[PDB]
RNA sequence: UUAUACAAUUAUCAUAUUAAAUUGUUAAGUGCUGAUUUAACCAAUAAAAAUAUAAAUAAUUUUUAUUUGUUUUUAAACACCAUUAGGUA
């Protein structure tokens, strides 16, 4: 048959695709500094960086770390394409 | 063969007598007295059905009916040819 | 049992005998019978019973319940019996009854060739959809290979006994080449059309209705 | 072809015929057309003479 | 505004081409042969395929089989006693009948997946998806492609999501979410891998938008994936350009989601990008204009642009955009144009397009006959055109279905002619031997009842259609309007015995009596003076209003007064007339409007919503014949019965007939 | 009952568990489904200590019975929402509610001889009995128990 | 389009092995 | 009017096909019981347990064998107690 | 059957969570297993 | 009947056969039919067939009174009067041209024949 | 003249017996249900053209079992060959 493992004891995935894709491409594992800016209040309770991967194309809430602003960005634009706080980038243009 | 294998169980004493040739109703707490009847019956090459009354679904129906066939409350009891 | 399941799917009260006690009810009375006996809203005799002689006539709700039975209940009971709450077998029986409404001769007819062909084709669609998500099921491969041959036989006899319904079924579902010879080597020796002779279908076509036979 | 299914076909050849004489209505006697000539004579080829 | 934008983009592209050719080397001015006013994305891929075919490596690899005179002798030499290995291309085969079923050259087993796992670095995944047997699920296909570490281009990702999209299309409607989640997971696997080299391009986003169109997710296709492709285009141009396939996927999503303005906006974005659209894009735009015209017709029947007259101007120019670039007409273009012209209530354009389809070569696609009958629905005088269109299907290879017969009877019911419906039923519908729908019987009796001077043969056809509808089943409940129109036909014919015997059928179905049915019975009793009816019949129809429940009407006092004439005094009828004269005066003293008998409305739904008795069959006979998904038929056990294997003489009763084992 | 779930949840504060149950209920209602019932069973100590997302064994757990009527695809959506929740340690999906257990794999003659409405129309507590439930409790509901149980304490109040 | 040359080389190498079958042993 | 052609011995003998979707289901016992429901006891004459012929011309020419046969209209069909043995 | 509507969902959840509280003048019901669970107070802390 | 529909008791076959025997006209029996339909009373399937057979027999004597009212004034029957003798009511639940529609339902294997 | 070749073996022309069973990733159970135990939830699968005399009315497909490949901080473990640690799977 087929063997399975549960990512953070919740997400049942098949064992072969987990060692190749699902385990090393999680948000809390591969980009912990990005996963530290996860918004705990506005995001759904069944969605958290221990199970959501890097290339999650749907926009999630991000709480900014340098400034205090909540914004909606996709996880793939934040990690792969490169994203930041819209208030911080408009304060960066205002400063310099 | 034509039907799947099923363990026989019944709440009546005479359903055991009409089915098997030699029936014995033992208890688990009396291992010596059932072992001597196992030695005697297997010496004469007789097919025997041993019913352990411990962990049975019809204990109180069978403990009442064994008191009517045999006046003593002694277990095990051998039943040959009804 | 495979015929009793389809008889339970088609007819309404074939399970219930004249004693009004099922085979599951006689051994499990606390699970099959009703626990509470309510003296309240007796529905009485159904005067709308002429519209639904078979369960293929009412597939708009769950358990083939007609809309005349759901009158005094609130919207939650009517929503729990709606089309969205139907199971997969009930949705497949609704798809079967959609064509049974179209191609049946009488209301208790299930063995017409136009009905049998679309039933075999719906079964082939179900088996192919199961083999798409699970290609490692080896029994469904054999059952699909048998059901496609039975569908070919049903459509090939439907082509000869009633050509208009066959042409309608071919045109409506975008399957034009579903009756094709597999091999050229056997087709050149007339073995594909000899099925028309060996099955008893060689003179089924009425010549006055399609051509001029003079 | 399979010859054992012939006579049953003959029964159908009865039943298709007797329906055809009973279903449609004959309007009248159609006039007889003059038959032409066939080019499929048996034997060898003839000459143009 | 699409044609004006097309002319503006064409003249801008011409001016840009002229200034670029006069700035570069003035070589196109020296040639001056032609200049395309648009751009075509498919020309690059078609020219690349045509140059790949004519390459010497492709013609050397796909050489035919070597003959016996080319190999050598008659045989005996090893290696030269047969031909060599022949390789075929499944899209452009240089042999007929690629597969065979012989004993030794049997090759269907070697076409399955696994023999092409030997060369996955050179593999073409679209040819693998189209021509292979026993392929796994596309997540496992992507796992095997990424496990071998092959550098997947955009075409491989587009092929794998196209395989997942075909799995989505073949499934049921209630099982689309899980395969779409598999598509989303394969797409994120293609994003975050980055070793082996995997790039997501415009074809992969187009396939994701097509998957969202197939499963039916507007908020997931347009807001997520289309915006992501637009962000990738505007973030880095000249390596990520939106071709015609991405906008065709967007138009498919706008059609499947019902969004009208976004599809016209993306077609205008196609036009403003100086590239030509495909024919299917114009078909989808005509479908969206049909949806908008039907919505405006429903909004004006109920009571961006509130002017419906300009929607026809913006719609017909899409048909004028077909002859703008080249864009040859196909069958779906004819279907969408006739649907758009039926949505704008213009039947003359439909009658022009049905002749334009027969002009060059276009198959006339029986839905086109549905829109042909639906276009002339509210136009009088076209009865013989309906009678001739039904005769045109037999030379065109088509057979009429129940939808076309319901549309023909809808025309007959709206024009209330009656004889045309009988002429259709007698020599077009009896020979079909099909089951009538209740809408069909309803429109037939609505045509026969509301017609001027009905006949008793209409009554015979109506009662035999009612008995044929009762002999089979139905899901809709139109029993009461069918019997209401049947009693109206008996009113206009004067048969009180046929209408009185039809009350037992309304009793047997549990339907309650209304005032319109007893008013029809009273009007039948007024017109029965030659056939039947008496002074007790109107007393019984008075009692039908009296004791059941039914309140009389302002049309009841007309019918009972007409039944008073030429029948007798009947003082109980006179007291009922006095009761009506008191009640109709009292409810008017209260201030209520005079309520007459309402007419049953004629159903005028378009043929795309007419209770189609089909769901979908996604079966393909190619996967049935070639035995994809590993379809295994068990062989019979030693049922050869061949003559070459037999080596015994067959005698009656065998050699030793009666043998006793002692 | 069409579907039932036994949610094992982490004993957090009241607001977090209420937000979790509210998100589960709004995921049920947003997919076009109906909640038959939802009952809290308090904090119990299970025989096995479940681990949370940060791999800490929890000695205590809250059990919640949730009976719903949802379509199959929407039930799959709600099940993948529930099983991937951060508070839900374990949740079994009761799918044997319309047909009783032992009919499909049992006797082949007793396969089409059952009525699915008998189990569909009743709740989950009337299919799976608790130890406190018995037939005497169900017969007490229709026996006019108000006029009969008024003299049940006439012997104990004097001693 | 680009991987047809190595497929051609594999096909011609297979044909060369089938011609090597003429030599027989060793 | 177009009528459907009867194909096979089951449709030509007019099988009811009461069981859903199965055309090869045995039909003799149900048809025999429905034919027994069809007959009536007429009083101002029932049938006997002897075998019956559908037509008066189908009687045997032997006068002694004619005593064991009688004429039943449509109750002469589906006669018998045993079924076709298998295995 | 008393279904829970969408408007009465939060109130029903807050009523079900207040089933086992510390201060109560009514006897607590048994669970689905037939066992009295651990009582708690407000904010969900186990007594 | 609203009380009988609330209490949920079944009307017997002998009850409704004696109920519709006391109806004289055809319009009176349709009042009894739509009252018990509105009141939601319960009955057997034989009670429904014996009720609709009484509705069939009441229309037959209703038309026989009409065809004799024109016979007494004209002195000779019409072709429509003699066609009523042979055919009768066409749309009927239990018509006379197929006398086997009461064998499975009724336990007596015979229709109840009322006389006056 | 066998128009017949006794069994078991040496070897070639070869259908997996299935509601007691197979598969389940997008469905279930799951530490690979077989340590205990002749009994395992749910989902898909038991029947469905003519003809039995008819002279092949049928298909050219699949692998549940064993090895071997497919990838490298990319199985922590357990087991195995060099002796205590490497590799192998
Ligand atoms: Zn910020």
Pick the closest to residue E3 from E322, E234, E292 (CA basis): E322
Q: Please enumerate in sequence order all residues whose Cβ is within 8 A of that of E174, keeping only pairs 6 or more positions apart, or say none.
A: C88, C91, F71, F72, F73
Those residues whose C-beta lies under 8 Å from the C-beta of residue C60, and which sit 6 or more positions away, are C67, C83, E475
Q: Measured between alpha carbons, how far is residue E269 from residues E39, E204, E272, E276 in Å?
A: 14, 20, 5, 11
Burial of H48: CB neighbours in 10 Å, binned 0-12, 13-18, 19+: exposed
Query: Cβ-count burial of J107 within 10 angstroms (0-12 exposed, 13-18 middle, 19+ buried)?
Result: exposed
- DSSP-derived letter for residue A82 is I
Task: Please give the structure tokens belonging to residue J64.
Answer: 């026989």
Cα–Cα distance, E626 to E185 (Å, whole number): 31
Q: Has A67 been labeled as part of a binding site?
A: yes
C76: chain I residues, CB-CB within 8 Å: 1, 3, 5
> In sequence order, which residues have a C-beta less than 8 Å from that of residue E280 and are 6 or more positions away?
E248, E251, E332
Report how far residue E451's alpha carbon sits from residue E488's, in angstroms, rounded to the nearest whole number.
11
**Token code pair at residue F112:** 């089409």
Q: Regarding beta strands H70-71 and H52-53, do their DSSP bridges make them parallel or antiparallel, or are they unpaired?
A: parallel
Buried b (16+ CB within 10 A) or exposed e, E72-102: eeeeeeebbeeebeeeeeeeeeeeeeeeeee
Calculate the alpha carbon distances from E39 to C136, E43, E319 in Å: 47, 9, 20
Asked if E178 is an interface residue toward chain F (Cβ–Cβ < 8 A), one would say yes
Burial status of residue E21 (CB atoms within 10 A of its CB: 0-12, 13-18, 19 or more): middle
E430, E466 contact by CB (below 8 A): no
3-state class (DSSP) for residue F65: strand
Inspect the interface and report whether the beta carbons of A17 and E139 lie closer than 8 Å.
yes
Angstrom distance (rounded) from CA B69 to CA B17: 12
Chain H contact for J100, CB < 8 A? Answer: yes
Q: Which two tokens stand for residue E232?
A: 């990738």
For residue C212, the tally of other CB atoms under 10 A from its CB is 6
Instruction: Tell me what percent of chain D is helix, strand and coil, each rounded to the nearest 5.
Output: 45, 0, 55
Cα–Cα nearest to C174, from C139, C113, C125, C208: C125
Residues in chain E, total = 662
Burial class for C210, CB neighbours closer than 10 Å (0-12, 13-18, 19+):
exposed
Quickly count: other Cβ atoms within 10 Å of residue J100's Cβ: 12
**Nearest nucleotide (C1') to alpha carbon of C145:** K61
If you measure from the C-alpha of residue A89 to the centroid of ligand 1, how many angstroms do you get, rounded to a whole number? 8
Chain A residues with CB inside 8 Å of E231's CB?
77, 81
Whether F84 and chain E come into contact, CB under 8 Å, resolves to no
Alpha carbon distance F131, F134 (integer Å): 8
Output E415-421 pairs: Cβ under 8 A, ≥24 positions apart.
E415/E380, E415/E383, E416/E447, E416/E450, E416/E451, E416/E452, E417/E383, E417/E447, E417/E451, E418/E447, E418/E448, E418/E450, E418/E451, E418/E452, E418/E454, E418/E458, E419/E451, E420/E383, E420/E386, E420/E387, E420/E447, E421/E447, E421/E448
Question: CA–CA separation, F21 vs F85, rounded Å?
Answer: 11
Give A49's contacts in chain F (Cβ within 8 Å). none
What would the 3-class secondary structure string for B19-32 be? Answer: CCCEEEEECCCCHH
DSSP for E194-260 reads -SS-----HHHHHHHHHHHHHHT-HHHIIIIIIHHHHHHHHHS-SSS---HHHHHHHHHHHHHHT-S
Would residue C72 be called left, alpha or beta, if left means φ above 0 and alpha means ψ between -120 and 50 degrees? alpha
E652 touches strand K (CB under 7 A): no
Task: Tell me the C-alpha distance between E452 and E419, whole Å.
Answer: 10
According to DSSP, the β-strands at A11-14 and A4-7 are antiparallel
Nearest-10 Cα torsion for H73, H74, H78, H81: -40
Helix, strand, coil share (%) of chain J residues, nearest 5: 60, 5, 40
A64 annotated to bind ligand? yes
E174 near F CB under 8 A: yes
- Å from CA of A69 to ligand 1 middle: 5
C-alpha span between J61 and J66 (Å, rounded): 9
Rg (CA), chain B: 13
Question: How far does the centroid of ligand 1 lie from the alpha carbon of residue A63, in Å?
Answer: 8
H/E stretch holding H70: strand H70-71
What distances in angstroms separate CA E642 from CA B22, E101, E445, E645, J72, one per listed residue? Answer: 59, 19, 65, 6, 88
Q: Of the candidates E497, E429, E492, which has an alpha carbon nearest to the alpha carbon of residue E464?
A: E429
Peptide bond into J83 cis (omega under 30): no
Torsions phi, psi for E143 (to 5 deg): -65, -40
A76 chain-E contacts, CB cut-off 8 A: 188, 191-192
DSSP letter (8 states) at residue E172: -
Q: Residue E561: which residues within 8 A CB-CB, separation 6 or more? A: E577
Yes or no, beta carbons of E224 and A54 under 8 Å apart: no
Q: Strand K: which of residues 160-189 in chain C lie with Cβ below 7 A?
A: 182-183
Give CA separation, E95 vs E89, E91, E547, F142, in Å.
9, 11, 85, 83
Resolution (A): 3.3
- CA separation for the pair E213, E254 (Å, rounded): 8
DSSP state of A26: B
Q: Does C82 touch chain H (CB under 8 A)?
A: no
Residue nearest K61 (alpha carbon to C1'): E632
- Closest residue of H to J99, CA-based? H38
| Both structure tokens of E213 | 């169109």
Nearest chain E CA: its distance from J7 CA (Å): 22
Spatial separation of the C-alpha atoms in residues A13 and E391, rounded to whole Å: 61
- Long-range contact list for H41-49, CB < 8 A, 24+ apart? H41/J109, H47/H72, H47/H75
Q: Which residue in chain C is spatially nearest to D17 when comparing CA positions? A: C206
Question: Which of D1, C173, J30, C59 lies closest to E512 in space, CA to CA?
Answer: J30
I3 touches chain C (CB under 8 A): yes
Whether the CB of F81 is below 8 Å from some CB of chain E: the reply is no
Residues C168-177 as b/e (b if ≥16 CB within 10 A, e otherwise) read bbbbbbebee
Q: Which residues of F fall within a CB distance of 8 Å from I34?
A: 130-132
Residues of chain H with C-beta less than 8 angstroms from the C-beta of J104: 37
Q: Which residues, listed in sequence order, are joined to residue A74 by a DSSP beta bridge?
A: A59
Written as six digits, the tokens of H80 are 């018998």
Tell me if J109 and H38 make a contact (CB, 8 A cut-off): no
Two structure tokens written together for H25: 């289901």
Is omega for the bond preceding C110 within 30 degrees of 0, making it cis?
Answer: no
> Is strand K less than 7 A from the beta carbon of E110?
no
For the stretch D5-12, contacts whose Cβ atoms lie closer than 8 Å and that sit 24 or more positions apart, written own/partner, are D5/C197, D5/C198, D5/C200, D8/C200, D9/C200, D9/C202, D9/C203, D12/C203
Phi, psi of F8 (to 5 degrees): -95, 120
Cα atoms in the Cβ-side hemisphere of radius 13 Å centred on C130:
15
DSSP H or E run through E101: none
Give the whole-angstrom CA distance, residue G4 versus residue E57. Answer: 7
A88 annotated to bind ligand:
yes
Query: Measured over all CA atoms, what is the biggest interatomic distance in chain F, rounded to whole angstroms?
Result: 62
| Residue C135 approaches strand K within 7 Å at CB | yes
- Measure in Å the smallest separation between the Cα of D38 and chain C Cα atoms: 17
* Nucleotide closest in space to C183 (CA vs C1'): K60
Strand K within 7 A of E178 CB = yes
Q: Please compute, for residue E285, the number of CA atoms within 13 A of its CA located in the half-sphere on the CB side.
A: 28
- Judge whether F42 and I19 are in contact, CB under 8 Å: yes
- Give residues 99-128 of chain C lying near strand K (Cβ < 7 A): 111, 116, 119-120, 123, 126-127
Chain centre distance of CA E468: 28
User: E595 CA, K7 C1': separation in Å?
Assistant: 103
Query: Of the candidates C106, C125, C145, which has its C-beta nearest E633's C-beta?
Result: C145
Q: How far, in Å, CA of E194 to CA of A79, rounded?
A: 13
Looking from the CA of C95 toward its CB, the CA atoms found within 13 Å total 21
Question: Where are the strands (E) in chain F, listed by range?
Answer: 3-9, 34-44, 50-51, 57-58, 61-69, 88-94
Residue with tokens 């499934």: E171
Q: How was this structure determined?
A: cryo-EM
The residues near C149 (Cβ < 8 Å, ≥ 6 apart) are: E633
Rounded-to-integer distance, Cα E537 and Cα C15, Å:
48
Contact D2 C197 (CB under 8 A): yes
Compute chain H's Rg from CA coordinates. Answer: 16
Cα distance between residue H72 and residue H67, in whole Å: 14
Round to whole Å and give the CA distance between C75 and E52.
65
Tell me the residue length of chain I: 47
CA pair distance C109, A41, nearest whole angstrom: 61
Contact (Cβ atoms closer than 8 angstroms) between residue A63 and residue A34:
no
Sequence-separated (6 or more) residues with CB below 8 Å from residue E548 = E513, J30, J31, J34
Closest Cα in chain I to C79: I3
Residue nearest to nucleotide K16 (CA to C1'): E634
Q: Residue E308 has which token pair?
A: 């419906």
The answer to whether J27 and E543 are in contact (CB under 8 A) is yes
Q: Cα dist. F42→F7, F38, F129 in Å?
A: 12, 13, 19
């Amino acid at each position: 048959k087929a063997s399975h493992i549960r990512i953070a004891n919740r997400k049942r995935v098949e064992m072969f695709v987990a060692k190749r894709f699902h385990l090393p491409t999680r948000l809390a594992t591969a980009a912990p500094d990005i996963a530290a800016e996860w918004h705990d209040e506005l995001n759904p309770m069944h969605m958290y960086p221990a199970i959501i991967g890097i290339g999650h194309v749907q926009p999630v809430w991000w709480k900014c770390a340098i400034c205090s602003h909540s914004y909606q960005m996709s996880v793939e634009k934040r990690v792969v394409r490169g994203g930041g706080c819209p208030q911080c980038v408009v304060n960066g243009k205002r400063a310099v | 063969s034509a039907t799947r294998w099923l363990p026989f169980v019944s709440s009546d004493l005479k359903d055991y007598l009409n089915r098997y040739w030699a029936v014995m109703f033992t208890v688990g707490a009396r291992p010596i007295e059932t072992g001597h009847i196992r030695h005697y019956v297997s010496w004469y090459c007789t097919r025997m059905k041993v019913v352990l009354l411990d962990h049975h679904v019809y204990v109180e129906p069978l403990r009442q009916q064994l008191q009517e066939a045999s006046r003593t409350p002694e277990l095990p009891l051998l039943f040959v040819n009804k | 049992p495979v015929q009793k399941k389809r008889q339970e799917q088609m007819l309404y009260g074939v399970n219930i005998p004249e004693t009004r006690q099922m085979k599951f009810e006689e051994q499990h009375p606390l699970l099959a019978g009703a626990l509470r006996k309510l003296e309240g809203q007796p529905k009485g005799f159904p005067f709308w019973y002429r519209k639904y002689p078979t369960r293929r006539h009412a597939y708009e709700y769950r358990f083939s319940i007609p809309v005349e039975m759901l009158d005094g209940y609130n919207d939650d009971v009517k929503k729990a019996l709606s089309k969205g709450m139907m199971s997969i077998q009930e949705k497949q029986f609704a798809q079967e009854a959609m064509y049974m409404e179209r191609y049946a001769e009488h209301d208790f007819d299930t063995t017409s060739p136009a009905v049998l062909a679309v039933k075999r084709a719906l079964k082939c669609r179900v088996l192919r959809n199961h083999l798409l998500t699970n290609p490692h099921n080896n029994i469904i491969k054999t059952v699909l290979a048998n059901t496609e041959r039975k569908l070919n036989h049903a459509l090939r006899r439907l082509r000869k006994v009633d050509f208009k319904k066959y042409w309608e079924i071919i045109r409506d579902h975008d399957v034009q080449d579903i009756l094709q010879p597999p091999n050229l080597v056997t087709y050149r020796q007339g073995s594909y059309w000899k099925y028309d002779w060996n099955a008893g279908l060689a003179i089924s076509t009425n010549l006055a209705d399609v051509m001029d036979p003079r | 072809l399979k010859a054992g299914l012939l006579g049953h076909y003959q029964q159908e050849a009865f039943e298709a015929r007797k329906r055809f004489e009973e279903s449609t209505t004959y309007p009248g006697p159609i006039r007889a057309a003059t038959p032409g000539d066939t080019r499929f004579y048996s034997g060898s080829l003839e000459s143009i003479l | 505004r699409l044609a004006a934008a097309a002319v503006k983009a064409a003249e801008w592209y011409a001016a840009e081409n002229r200034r670029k050719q006069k700035g570069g080397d003035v070589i196109r001015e020296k040639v001056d042969c032609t200049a395309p006013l648009w751009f075509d994305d498919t020309e690059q891929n078609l020219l690349a395929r045509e140059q790949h075919v004519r390459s010497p490596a492709y013609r050397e690899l796909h050489r035919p089989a070597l003959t016996n005179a080319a190999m050598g002798l008659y045989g005996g030499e090893p290696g030269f006693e047969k031909a060599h290995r022949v390789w075929v291309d499944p899209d452009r085969p240089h042999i007929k009948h690629i597969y065979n079923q012989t004993a030794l050259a049997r090759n269907l087993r070697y076409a399955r997946y696994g023999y092409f796992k030997r060369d996955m670095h050179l593999l073409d995944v679209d040819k693998l998806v189209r021509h292979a047997r026993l392929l796994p699920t596309p997540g496992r296909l992507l796992t095997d492609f990424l496990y071998q570490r092959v550098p997947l281009p955009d075409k491989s990702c587009a092929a794998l999501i196209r395989y997942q999209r075909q799995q989505i299309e073949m499934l049921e409607v209630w099982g689309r979410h899980a395969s779409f989640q598999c598509a989303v997971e394969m797409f994120e696997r293609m994003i975050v891998t980055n070793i082996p080299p995997v790039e997501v391009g415009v074809e992969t986003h187009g396939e994701m938008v097509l998957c969202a169109a197939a499963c039916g997710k507007w908020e997931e296709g347009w807001n997520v994936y289309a915006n992501r492709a637009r962000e990738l285009e505007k973030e880095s141009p000249e390596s990520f350009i939106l071709n015609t396939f991405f906008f065709d996927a967007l138009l498919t999503l706008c059609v499947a989601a019902g969004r009208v303005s976004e599809g016209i906006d993306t077609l205008e974005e196609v036009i403003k990008r100086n590239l030509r659209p495909r024919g299917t894009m114009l078909n989808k735009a005509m479908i969206l204009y049909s949806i908008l015209g039907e919505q405006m017709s429903k909004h004006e029947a109920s009571r961006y642009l509130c002017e419906p007259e300009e929607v026809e101007k913006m719609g017909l120019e899409v048909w004028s955009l077909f002859d703008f670039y080249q864009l040859p007409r196909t069958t779906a273009s004819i279907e969408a144009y006739m649907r758009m012209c039926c949505a704008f209530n213009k039947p003359t354009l439909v009658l022009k397009a049905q002749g334009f389809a027969d002009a060059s070569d276009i198959r006339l696609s029986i839905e086109c006959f549905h829109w042909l009958v639906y276009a002339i629905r509210g136009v009088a005088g076209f009865g013989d055109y309906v009678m001739d269109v039904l005769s045109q299907l037999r030379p065109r290879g088509l057979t009429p279905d129940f939808v076309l017969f319901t549309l023909s009877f809808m025309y007959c019911a709206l024009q209330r002619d009656g004889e045309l419906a009988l002429a259709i039923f007698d020599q077009h519908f009896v020979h079909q031997n099909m089951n009538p729908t209740p809408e069909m019987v309803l429109l037939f009796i609505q045509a026969c009842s509301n017609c001027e001077e009905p006949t008793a043969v209409m009554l015979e056809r109506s009662e035999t259609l009612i008995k044929r509808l009762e002999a089979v089943g139905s899901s809709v409940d139109l029993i009461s309007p069918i019997y209401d129109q049947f009693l109206e036909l008996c009113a206009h014919l004067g048969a009180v015995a046929s209408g009185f015997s039809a009350l037992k059928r309304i009793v047997g179905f549990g339907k309650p009596l209304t005032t319109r049915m007893i008013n029809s019975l009273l009007l039948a009793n007024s017109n029965a003076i030659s056939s039947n009816g008496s002074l007790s019949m109107t007393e019984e129809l008075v009692g039908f209003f009296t004791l059941l429940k039914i309140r009389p009407n302002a049309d009841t006092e007309i019918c009972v007064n007409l039944c008073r004439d030429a029948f007798g005094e009947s003082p109980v009828v006179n007291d009922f007339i006095k009761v009506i004269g008191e009640s109709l005066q009292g409810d008017s003293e209260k201030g209520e409007a005079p309520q007459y008998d309402e007419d049953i409305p004629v159903i005028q739904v378009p043929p795309h919503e007419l209770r189609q008795l089909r769901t979908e069959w996604k079966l393909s006979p190619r996967d049935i014949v070639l035995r994809r998904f590993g379809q295994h038929t068990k062989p019979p056990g030693k049922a050869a019965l061949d003559v070459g294997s037999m080596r015994g003489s067959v005698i009656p009763f065998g050699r030793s007939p009666g043998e006793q084992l002692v | 009952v069409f579907y039932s779930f036994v949610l094992v949840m982490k004993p957090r504060q009241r607001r977090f568990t209420s937000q979790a149950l509210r998100e589960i209920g709004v995921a049920v209602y947003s997919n076009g489904g109906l909640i038959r019932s939802i009952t809290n069973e308090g904090i119990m100590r299970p025989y096995s200590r479940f681990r949370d997302a940060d791999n800490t064994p929890l000695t205590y757990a809250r059990y919640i019975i949730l009976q719903l009527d949802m379509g199959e695809e929407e039930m799959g959506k709600v099940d993948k929402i529930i099983r991937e929740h951060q508070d839900v340690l374990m949740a079994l999906k009761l799918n044997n509610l319309e047909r009783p257990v032992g009919i499909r794999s049992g006797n082949k003659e007793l396969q089409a001889a059952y009525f699915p409405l008998d189990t569909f129309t009743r709740l989950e507590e009337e299919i799976n009995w608790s130890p406190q439930t018995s037939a005497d409790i169900y017969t007490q509901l229709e026996m006019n128990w108000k006029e009969f149980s008024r003299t049940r304490w006439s012997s104990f109040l004097r001693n | 389009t680009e991987g047809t040359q190595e497929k051609l080389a594999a096909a011609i190498q297979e044909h060369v092995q089938d011609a090597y079958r003429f030599s027989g042993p060793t | 009017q177009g009528h459907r052609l009867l194909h096979g011995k089951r449709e030509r003998e007019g099988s009811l096909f009461a069981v859903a979707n199965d055309v090869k289901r045995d039909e003799r016992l149900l048809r025999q019981q429905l034919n027994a429901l069809l007959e009536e006891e007429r009083m101002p004459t029932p049938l006997v347990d002897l075998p019956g012929v559908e037509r008066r011309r189908d009687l045997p020419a032997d006068p002694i064998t004619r005593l064991f046969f009688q004429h039943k209209g449509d109750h002469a069909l589906y006669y018998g107690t045993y079924d076709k043995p298998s295995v | 059957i008393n279904y829970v509507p969408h408007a009465q969902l939060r109130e029903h959840i807050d009523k079900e969570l207040d089933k086992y509280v510390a201060g109560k003048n009514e006897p607590y019901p048994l669970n689905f297993v037939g066992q009295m669970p651990f009582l708690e107070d407000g904010d969900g802390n186990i007594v | 009947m609203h009380l009988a529909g609330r209490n949920g008791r079944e009307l017997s076959v002998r009850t409704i056969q004696h109920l519709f025997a006391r109806t004289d006209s055809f319009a009176e029996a349709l009042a009894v039919f739509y009252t018990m339909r509105r009141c939601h009373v319960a009955m057997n399937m034989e009670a429904y067939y014996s009720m609709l057979y009484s509705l069939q027999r009441l229309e037959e004597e209703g038309w026989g009174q009409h065809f004799r009212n024109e016979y007494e004034e004209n002195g000779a029957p019409s072709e429509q009067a003699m066609d009523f003798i042979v055919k009768g009511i066409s749309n009927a639940l239990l018509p006379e041209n197929k006398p086997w529609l009461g064998r499975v339902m009724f336990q007596d294997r015979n229709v109840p024949d009322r006389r006056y």
